[PDB]
Amino acid sequence: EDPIVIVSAVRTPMGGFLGDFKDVNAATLGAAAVRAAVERARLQADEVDEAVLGCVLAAGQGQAPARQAVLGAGLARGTPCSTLNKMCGSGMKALMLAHDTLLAGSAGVALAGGMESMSNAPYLLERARSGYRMGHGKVLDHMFLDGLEDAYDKGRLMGTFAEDCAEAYGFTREAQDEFAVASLTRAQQAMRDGRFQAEIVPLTVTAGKTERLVDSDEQPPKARLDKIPTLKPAFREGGTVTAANSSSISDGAAALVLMRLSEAERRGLAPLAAIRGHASFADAPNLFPTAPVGAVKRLMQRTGWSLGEVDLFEVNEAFAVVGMAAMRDLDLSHERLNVHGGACALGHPIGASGARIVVTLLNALQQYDLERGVAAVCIGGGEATAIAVERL
Amino acid sequence: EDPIVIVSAVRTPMGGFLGDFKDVNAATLGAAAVRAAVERARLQADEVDEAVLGCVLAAGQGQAPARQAVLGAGLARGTPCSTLNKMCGSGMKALMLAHDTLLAGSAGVALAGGMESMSNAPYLLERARSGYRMGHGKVLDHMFLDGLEDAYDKGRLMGTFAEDCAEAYGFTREAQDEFAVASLTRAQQAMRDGRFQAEIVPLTVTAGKTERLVDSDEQPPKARLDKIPTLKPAFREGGTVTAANSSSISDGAAALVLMRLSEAERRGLAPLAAIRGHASFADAPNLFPTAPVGAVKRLMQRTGWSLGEVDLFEVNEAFAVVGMAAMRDLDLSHERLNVHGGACALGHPIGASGARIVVTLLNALQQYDLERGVAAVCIGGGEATAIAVERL
Amino acid sequence: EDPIVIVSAVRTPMGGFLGDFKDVNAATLGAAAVRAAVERARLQADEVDEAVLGCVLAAGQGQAPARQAVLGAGLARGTPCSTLNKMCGSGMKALMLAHDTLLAGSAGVALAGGMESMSNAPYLLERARSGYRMGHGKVLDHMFLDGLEDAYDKGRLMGTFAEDCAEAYGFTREAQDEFAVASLTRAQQAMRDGRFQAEIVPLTVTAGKTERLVDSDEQPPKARLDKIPTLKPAFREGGTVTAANSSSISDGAAALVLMRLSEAERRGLAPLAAIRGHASFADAPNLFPTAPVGAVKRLMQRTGWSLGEVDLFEVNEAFAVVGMAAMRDLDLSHERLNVHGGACALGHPIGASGARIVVTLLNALQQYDLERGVAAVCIGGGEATAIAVERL
Amino acid sequence: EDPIVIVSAVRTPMGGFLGDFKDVNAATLGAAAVRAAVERARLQADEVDEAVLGCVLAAGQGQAPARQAVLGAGLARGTPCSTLNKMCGSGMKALMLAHDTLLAGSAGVALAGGMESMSNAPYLLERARSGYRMGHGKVLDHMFLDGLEDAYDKGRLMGTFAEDCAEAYGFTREAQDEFAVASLTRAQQAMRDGRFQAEIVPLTVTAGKTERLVDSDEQPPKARLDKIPTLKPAFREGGTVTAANSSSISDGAAALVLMRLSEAERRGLAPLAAIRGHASFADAPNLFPTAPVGAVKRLMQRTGWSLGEVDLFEVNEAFAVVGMAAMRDLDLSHERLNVHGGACALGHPIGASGARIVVTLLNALQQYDLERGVAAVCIGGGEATAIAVERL
After folding, report:
1. Is residue A25 less than 8 Å (CB to CB) from chain B?
2. D333 touches chain C (CB under 8 A)
3. Rounded Cα distance, D385 and D281, in Å
4. Which residue range or ranges hold the Thiolase C-terminal domain (chains A, B, C, D) (predicted)?
5. Closest partner residue to B138 among D138, D144, D145, by Cβ?
6. CATH assignment, A4-121+248-390
7. Residue-range domain boundaries for chain A
């Protein structure tokens, strides 16, 4: 048995929109995570022979964001780099491609992760090139058009499909708000008891003339529990889904180093976990909130696991309904799901979350001395991915 | 021996900038190529387990360009999609990931390729979000900023690094122009003798009320051979590199279907070729024009091939100097390199070219009844990929 | 009796939107008209004491459009310039201010007119200064927002108020189309018989390497008489007003030189006509189409004229209904109104038209050896101006 | 003797750029001044038969800014309105045209003034209409391109010509800074002793959820005397002209009511002053800082006044050098010039300053019981205007 193992895993703090990382581009967040992941793996700067970083909103970053992040991290010029867009799942699909590249023998040491600066997403002029001709046009938010809106039902925010899911499942405004308060409570607790310290690499940001250490997640401490049940529906007249039971716009990155178990052992490197499998599921774009259920069932078949044998689940909290659908359809305890909080408290930097939730899962498995984790993420366009990890 | 085989391979015609496909988005070009590749593989809508499409300039396309192209082609909603940016090498890296996804056992049937509408890249406003405050600002061409300029020597076009290479190698104005004239001549002759017909899927384009059948490459017929020795240098005062010994901006797509030989045999599907290996190479961003030399040398080590056993080479003609460096440092006859012409005649739709040259290579190997091909592409950021294919 | 006299009067041809003058800015059109007006008055560069030019859409032209046009014409730097916006009436209000500046003794020789490049009006970003923050925004056509739409019923085009007037007056689709056909016929015939030749200054336009002489009105020759009864309503579901019984977007300029009769006699300069009076009228913005009725009635009170003593009328054809309201409420024969055609055939370069119709009126009075003319123009914001001219 | 008299005069406070009036458009500032001027003249809402308002930066305001201001003030629909651009002199040229319109008998009661929202000037896309085609372009600050930059030496700020004037006149950095400190001191004093109270109409601005009374000039209290001599030259390497010895960007409006003395007497209205003359001067655009000297000498000839007979001068402080040139060339005491401060302390809302300085001059003549004032303003494009007022 020579499975692929994760030997290192780290994330930046997750900043709020126009918050802590307002003036930090995606490649600098990526560089911070990449540097840390390689130092934690006890590797030299030239030992990564495949690097794949998730990123959805690449407009205005310049050529090859992942290349900018890897070279900005101090890794050697010889490091092959790719930038990967599988929407909200980009950071996990990076792990899955890196995993397969290692199994196929194309690489011996791979860096996977993702990064997003939602703050630095620019505006777009679709008809600047060839001409508006006459009449008003649109100045398009890149984050909205290329990140948050469906491509088929044009202009339709993903929150509308989360509302369809609330209606189909009978998820009440109150039950969504309770899931969101549990996520917010857990994150504040985790932060307070230092349960994120082992997984975070701080950044230094230039603060006008001075410099600040950002070493903690910006959003859980700023949340107002009192306003949650007061908010207007966000996506539909007289709906249940709100800003507070949806994930927020966020800036962050995450990076993990993978290799064969035999290569970790040949390096004297203690693995965090073996990857025991991964799964890809797709259906209609308007059914994305339930897609994680499909991915996790395919993952149980591919691994030979059962749901009952899994200690911890991370299901990315794009909306409370995504977590609540998974609890209903996979018969999971809220006690085993998103135990340190989730995107409803921490944010959803779209290209990083798929990797971020795997970093959080690894830390949490270690902290409670548990064996088996599953991470799953729903994906714009109607997809989900899921990954099984096991501590040895 | 159960190698991964390419069972189908197709491209759109390559259009000129604001030409034949000015009104066709990237996902429509990708959809045309994906649809024909699936048809030529005799597959039904739900038989592609994994789709990866290269695309560099994703801004303004909406969520998940590869998902739009796959569903636009008529493939089922169950088809997992990813959009890949490895700059000029995107289309080849797509083949490489699909290849390793099959070998890893993560899929039975994969689709790879790339697509680029440089015509529909939008303009960006980097400071529209938080304000320009006062004084003029930039409206940034996404194609220039995110596709054509170096990220490190900010604003420097890749043609300046091509001029560095012309200086380092002593490639004269005349020798580069002769390479470009052989590329245009070969392409014009390939067109006239029908040597592109087997590899091209025509598109129907709607010119207002009229409809037009685009079934041939736009650029070779419009080439002014007489003007080539008369152009000014394009990148450097007193230089050698011009618009005619550089590739042009181009719109296009290409797609290929891969599977184990044993799966192709089970389906009664005659393979075009076995993939015998692939290699990635990276060095300093400003040395990109010679990166293919590293990629091809690394490819001979991994495959166990030698240069002399290769029948045909495709080296993407980002600039004539890229081909000429490869001919000198790999000791290749011009007669075995880019034998139907290359990007200097056809164009360089950046996210598609790394797959497009594999399509052209496979058809050329078939026409001359040859066994062994190498395709290599240089890449913004200082990289290159190469792939080895063998007809059985 | 020492009345103010018009000694010269000239216009550019009127171009179609993005047509003949697509590449000519407003100040170049103004410069052509100013230069010929000064030449026809036999004046030298330093003999104009006051210049006022109408122009509505000044955005993106740089400082002081009228100053650019005056100096561009070759007039001396000593020439005081002002740019005037009274919407569709700018060109006439320029004549009115110049007229009163002479009578007041503030000048001996004044130049008035107007100029408009609707082709070169730019697009605006209303929130580029302080930021769009998040979500789509508007890129605003300066021509629409600042020229064509009501400021009070925000976004409402002036053609909706034209439809109100068609309803209030019972002007049928057929009757409006007949007015427009008489306007196109008269213009086409005026063109063919040379009846515009004395009033037009040709421009030389540079089409890349080629040069072209534009010496005739672009729009009347391109008019499809057959399509007029077939167009849809343009402003209201089930309405009567269309693109063909409305004026078109147009590029053009006009200029006139004024002075006391005694100054014209001192210079040996034969006047074209005496100004006998001018009137301003305003009412509710949504009644603009009938404002000329008020302006002309107020003009007969101030001059002591009656309608029956007037030989020719020019009422600017912003819409056919503007002419038809004037014909009904002023009891005017169609045979005495807009006898060489009007804006329905020629176009409506908004800042120029109020001066352009005076130029056409003066030439028409000369050709038919008639004495007395009235020009009137309706104005966005609910206004109108009219002027009385008499040949001696 | 029946001269034109000013019966009323008022201004808004002058806001700083993105300051007090950040969210107040030009027509609302105009409306406040217009309303007050008409109430102070003891006129009904329908008694103004000519309204001319200066405004340079009309982009994005909608149709007919002056019409929006007049109707927003509550004046009757019957009030004729024009928007006037004579750059920095717009507000005084409005007074001069209104004056001549009254003398010519075209109107009996005229409203003149100007208004500018420099904060609400938008950005422009010159090639949005017909296309950028390829390569970066500019997003143009309307305020910079159409307000502050020369049109002939393209991109050249007016501060560069003020530096040429410093060099030609030997105006030292220290002498400029001293003029600026005197202007700042005088304004703070004037404000402190309520010497602006009689001339200002407050506005109420909505302050998030609340509402603020803005009744005082924003800029003099915020100025830092200590930083003045520390600032870097603003316009030329190792120059003398700075941000603090130049006027600042400002938001404000001013309005004055004019009529014949016989009409003020027939209404029982006490005039503030008779207008005894006006003058217009123009020369090269790069000599604008000295143009006021030309205007004031022509004004002395036209009025039959001499410089020695004038009690107070207002010369608009576009730059300290403008004030200092006038002191040198007209042999004027700083004691008689800009006695309550000037644009170096208060700001330069470009389309209003020409009227603003006349309001300040009238108040100051009353406060010191003096007879004769001169106001003069330099004008982009190389012009100046000047007006003589006399208390009776």
Report:
1. no
2. no
3. 6
4. 270-391
5. D138
6. 3.40.47.10
7. 4-121+248-390
